[PDB]
């Protein structure tokens, strides 16, 4: 495991220092449907014509990225995802840019997002939540060993694949940092108290966010909610959490140790690091090798309909991919 991590780091470092660039072109793909949107732009199902492989293609508008002050963060996202390789995230298969846009092409996860399944079902059993949680613990172990902080854990970002496993998606705030960092970013419900309080923070925010996720998966709502973000932040910084009565003892105990304001006590952050989590009692029934190797049966598999089936996603207005005759923001994105 120390050894697995060492080799993964050597592989990651080579790509990190010598990033792949301009590895496809838009005309090599057929666009089939928009799967999702946000401030970043759009994610589309596309088919690579040469192979007939389907992929998710994220399309960013350079001028919008500039207006949003996300140049460096977008550069981070692309440089990271082209360099990683892990079962529960989607590295870049291809990337490129044109006059107007930035493109990132990744493995397509057909099952939809956890968020939609979670809301519809209400909540997940502790076993069901533990299956997903384990995939997160392993991805964070991997990411943090590479000096990467993720900074946006939430159900909306966890895409379900055909086997019922998870892909962590949207690395718009991921950063390679060896010390502390200061950017106010993330999603209100999932922000650690250090972020809200404008302290310099580290990877421990990712472990706090796991606490929020496990809670939300098991309860059906988040530990800290309200109608407006400022109400949510007061609740986070006070820090008092109430657990549903259906929560097991072991679940509450882990959550007390993840949702811990005291950084000297927050699990994931201590001298034993990720093993405080992996060896906590709530995970006692978890075989971490079988999870990595995807040999455990998923508590929920979405129905096979086709490798390009989009029915586990919403419908969105389908707008064009307009490519200017003039190159926008050349210097800003020169390394992309």
């Amino acid at each position: 495991v120390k050894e697995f991590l060492a080799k993964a780091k050597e592989d990651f470092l080579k790509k990190w220092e010598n990033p792949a660039q301009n590895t496809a072109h838009l005309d090599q793909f057929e666009r089939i449907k928009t799967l999702g949107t946000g401030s970043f732009g759009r994610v589309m199902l596309v088919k690579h014509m040469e192979t007939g492989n389907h992929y998710a293609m994220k399309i960013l508008d350079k001028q919008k990225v500039v207006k949003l002050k996300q140049i460096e963060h977008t550069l981070n996202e692309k440089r990271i995802l082209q360099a990683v390789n892990f079962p529960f995230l989607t590295k870049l298969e291809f990337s490129f840019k044109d006059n107007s846009n930035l493109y990132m092409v990744m493995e397509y996860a057909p099952g939809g997002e956890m968020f939609s399944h979670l809301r519809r079902i209400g909540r997940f059993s502790e076993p069901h939540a533990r299956f997903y949680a384990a995939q997160i613990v392993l991805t964070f172990e991997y990411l943090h060993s590479l000096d990467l902080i993720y900074r946006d854990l939430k159900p909306e970002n966890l895409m379900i694949d055909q086997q019922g496993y998870i892909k962590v998606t949207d690395f718009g705030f991921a950063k390679r940092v060896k010390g502390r960092t200061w950017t106010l970013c993330g999603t209100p419900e999932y922000l650690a108290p250090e972020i809200i309080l404008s302290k310099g923070y580290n990877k421990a925010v990712d472990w706090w966010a796991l606490g929020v996720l496990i809670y939300e998966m098991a309860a059906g709502y988040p530990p800290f909610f309200a109608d407006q973000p400022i109400q949510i932040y007061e609740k986070i910084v006070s820090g008092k959490v109430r657990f549903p009565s259906h929560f097991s003892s072991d679940l509450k105990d882990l959550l007390r140790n993840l949702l811990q304001v005291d950084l000297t006590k927050r699990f994931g952050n201590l001298k034993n690091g990720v093993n405080d989590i992996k060896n906590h009692k709530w995970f006692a029934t978890t075989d971490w090798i079988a999870i990595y190797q995807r040999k455990v049966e998923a508590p929920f598999i979405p129905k096979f309909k086709g490798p390009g089936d989009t029915s586990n996603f919403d419908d969105y207005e389908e707008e064009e991919i307009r490519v200017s005759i003039n190159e926008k923001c050349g210097k800003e994105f020169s390394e992309f």
Binding site: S39, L68, E156, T187, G220, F225, A226, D227, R242
Partner: peptide, 20 residues
């Protein structure tokens, strides 16, 4: 119930990342 308070709240749909 807490469940009823959540479902009646304005934040049961997909939540966006923050902007400053």
């Amino acid at each position: 119930t807490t469940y009823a308070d959540f479902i009646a709240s304005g934040r049961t749909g997909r939540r966006n990342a923050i902007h400053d």
